[PDB]
Amino acid sequence: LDNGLARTPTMGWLHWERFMCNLDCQEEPDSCISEKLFMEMAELMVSEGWKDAGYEYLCIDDCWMAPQRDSEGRLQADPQRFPHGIRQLANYVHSKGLKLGIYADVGNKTCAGFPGSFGYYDIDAQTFADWGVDLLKFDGCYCDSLENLADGYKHMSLALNRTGRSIVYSCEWPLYMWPFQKPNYTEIRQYCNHWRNFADIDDSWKSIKSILDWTSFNQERIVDVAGPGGWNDPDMLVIGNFGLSWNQQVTQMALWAIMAAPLFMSNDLRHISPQAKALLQDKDVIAINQDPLGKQGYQLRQGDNFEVWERPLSGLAWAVAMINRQEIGGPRSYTIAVASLGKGVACNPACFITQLLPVKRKLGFYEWTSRLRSHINPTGTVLLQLENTM
Amino acid sequence: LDNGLARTPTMGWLHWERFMCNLDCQEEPDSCISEKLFMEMAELMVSEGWKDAGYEYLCIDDCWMAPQRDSEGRLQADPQRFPHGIRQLANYVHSKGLKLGIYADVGNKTCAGFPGSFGYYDIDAQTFADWGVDLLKFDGCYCDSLENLADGYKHMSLALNRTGRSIVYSCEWPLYMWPFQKPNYTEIRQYCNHWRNFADIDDSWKSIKSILDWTSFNQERIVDVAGPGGWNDPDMLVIGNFGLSWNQQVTQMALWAIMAAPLFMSNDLRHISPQAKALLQDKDVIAINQDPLGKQGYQLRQGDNFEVWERPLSGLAWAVAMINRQEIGGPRSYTIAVASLGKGVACNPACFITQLLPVKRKLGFYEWTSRLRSHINPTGTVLLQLENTMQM
């Protein structure tokens, strides 16, 4: 989408995975979907270094709406859980130097059963712009036809454009199209800043593996379409929650950098381990994700329960990730000719290699003839950056 | 097995899950099955508090053997990887105050292809006793008949007895019966100190869930068989390795305490996080596992992606574990009448409740009519101890 936005993958926080559709503010006041939750997250995004690391979009997912529209047919936030309204919340978020994302659905209802935007695309776009919204996530539930799905996603893209406000447009169009028809990613990129391809992530290693496997399976279709203004979205970062071991968290962070993925944390910034925070705020890895060239990486090799992915970066540099998919035993040795990396140019005639994950360590100079050996933890990833000696 | 051993579930360390059958000492010297690995592991078991917490048996699994027996038809350790021999290794381990476990197979070969014990049961038992072995894990590969399987397990039990040396006898008999016929656990208990029931664990939450679900599904068949001298073995602890989140590690530790499981760590004690170490050395949870009453716990309830397990303990106390099996979202609330716990006895007329996991905190006095409310992390467990009292 040529709206000047998402020139690098969008970074921020999104409530869905960790907080879901909790409406019980009476019994769960600190975890229900409320304006207080988002205010606390914005406060911590400033005070705990998230904004400085690049996480900029504080995003509301489903279940913010009142059950019905206003008299003029406009969406309204729930009067009890969002008593001051979205425009005020956006004002607060902006006062923190942050941007505010909101959620709507292309069909007749949101996935959780709240008002859909079908028949109100222009009204809803102008409402979001008036509120000061900076990002829209657009879900695909309750849509009776593929033609209505495509038409709705394109119409909402155009309506957002016509408001004149810069609004990042995040689409679930491919995900809801895939079971029925192969998506045309040239068109999707024309209308969306990033797009969800695969099933919702949850707090499990199984979900990480599924997302990676589906991405590599479909890489010939989706890798080349991604770039500044339009990204593949493999769904939220779940680092800092409950289901991932440390090495599985490392794998998610490294591979979301390789994939030029949007980095939307879905966690509780009020209760997050120092290790999870240091990983999520890892300047070198974020710099890979945010590389201005914006070329998505890909799986180079798979075999012997290992995977090798790589990503071309600005200025003759490359990122390389090695995943150990064997879920038994100890760290396993993997060796690869450096001439096989970066299409044969990364280390011709030599490259300096720096390991970034799981720990940062300079490995030294590797000649074009060299072989790189590493030991990779089960379900973990070794992430390296290769700099051509010029 | 009425040999005076395993009056509580055996505790120690077993190499299989973490180190497997790595024979490449040239390229993977820190991971290969060698006498130096076991010597260093024994040193750390002493120096890092493992022995003090109760982990006493340093156990060799498969792939310690030479490819053939010696001229006298006796098993030998690999001359390159175990040049000083099992007897010296046992002397070293004993000098550290620890006990040494070894591995053999009921059939013609071990599962990795090394010499089996069929036809040599008495020779092999007396060999292990001469070496100073204190525990034998007995695998079931390469056995042509169920009759040979059962006869071999019983025969090796008797041969170990005949040596006169106290040797804990760990059997895989039930697991190897399952494809053909349901096991008779009365017989197995008569011959074994503990027995593996289910597939090998690996370094994954999937494996933990599978073991728990198979145990609860089959609990009416196996729970009452367990007791002092004979335990169900749901396989090694994998806390301290790579595949389990903190909450999943908590779940394994809590539930292995509930199940009166042998506690055989399979990890690398040279590279273990302080959090994993504190969990594995948790004195209160180990005390639950080692409860002298020796009655295995069970699943009390399951539903809405929650599980409630409980275990009766000595002196009218109970351990209660609540598992959140929903793998999305945040900590979920669970409420239960304390009268529903511990068969209605734990809190009659009252109980003092102490949360032990994921953090230790006294919760207070609960009357028989009261309700306990807790929040459980996704894939995590809350473990509580209930102490019966009349005080309030």
Ligand SMILES: *[C@@H]1O[C@H](CO)[C@@H](O[C@@H]2O[C@H](CO)[C@@H](O[C@@H]3O[C@H](CO)[C@@H](O)[C@H](O[C@H]4O[C@H](CO)[C@@H](O)[C@H](O)[C@@H]4O)[C@@H]3O)[C@H](O)[C@H]2NC(C)=O)[C@H](O)[C@H]1NC(C)=O
């Ligand atoms: C509604 O849709 C229209 C059409 O799709 C869209 O207009 C487009 O806006 C983008 C960004 O604002 C334009 O791209 C710019 O083109 C100008 C040409 O003068 C360039 O100078 C810009 O360069 C930027 O990036 C440079 C590096 O590449 C930097 O030097 C610097 O940061 C510049 O800002 C940039 O390429 C695009 O040309 C127009 N297209 C048309 C047809 O007008 C508009 O933004 C949309 N409006 C909303 C509210 O979404």
Ligand SMILES: *[C@@H]1O[C@H](CO)[C@@H](O[C@@H]2O[C@H](CO)[C@@H](O[C@@H]3O[C@H](CO)[C@@H](O)[C@H](O[C@H]4O[C@H](CO)[C@@H](O)[C@H](O)[C@@H]4O)[C@@H]3O)[C@H](O)[C@H]2NC(C)=O)[C@H](O)[C@H]1NC(C)=O
């Ligand atoms: C070879 O096998 C034989 C039997 O097949 C086995 O001897 C049996 O087991 C133990 C040996 O320690 C005996 O049990 C003891 O019996 C006396 C009887 O008065 C009791 O006082 C003992 O009680 C103490 O120890 C118990 C722990 O086991 C506690 O429960 C108790 O509170 C006391 O502390 C104990 O029960 C058993 O009687 C014999 N049975 C026979 C001989 O028929 C022998 O040990 C095996 N040898 C080897 C080397 O394994």
Ligand SMILES: *[C@@H]1O[C@H](CO)[C@@H](O[C@@H]2O[C@H](CO)[C@@H](O)[C@H](O)[C@H]2NC(C)=O)[C@H](O)[C@H]1NC(C)=O
């Ligand atoms: C996928 O969609 C794109 C855009 O909707 C199609 O590309 C356009 O094709 C028309 C002709 O049908 C050309 O006039 C445009 O110039 C093309 N646009 C771009 C940006 O190239 C493309 O044909 C579609 N592909 C399939 C297989 O349907």
Ligand SMILES: *[C@@H]1O[C@H](CO)[C@@H](O[C@@H]2O[C@H](CO)[C@@H](O)[C@H](O)[C@H]2NC(C)=O)[C@H](O)[C@H]1NC(C)=O
């Ligand atoms: C180990 O192998 C030997 C040789 O095959 C087995 O002995 C055979 O046993 C089968 C039935 O069990 C008989 O039909 C053969 O006549 C036996 N052959 C010999 C040479 O004795 C032995 O049973 C095997 N042991 C185990 C535990 O499977």
Ligand SMILES: *[C@@H]1O[C@H](CO)[C@@H](O)[C@H](O)[C@H]1NC(C)=O
């Ligand atoms: C919404 O419902 C109406 C009436 O049932 C239907 O005509 C319309 O196509 C629906 N819209 C979508 C996007 O499914």
Ligand SMILES: *[C@@H]1O[C@H](CO)[C@@H](O)[C@H](O)[C@H]1NC(C)=O
């Ligand atoms: C199991 O074995 C024991 C000991 O041999 C025997 O007493 C019992 O009857 C057996 N049970 C069944 C069901 O065969």
Ligand SMILES: CN1[C@H](CO)[C@H](O)[C@H](O)[C@H]1CN
């Ligand atoms: C079901 N919806 C949820 C909101 O209800 C999340 O936004 C999820 O991303 C989407 C399905 N892909």
Ligand SMILES: CN1[C@H](CO)[C@H](O)[C@H](O)[C@H]1CN
């Ligand atoms: C395959 N053997 C392995 C030794 O080779 C482990 O001892 C495992 O316990 C058993 C299978 N249940």
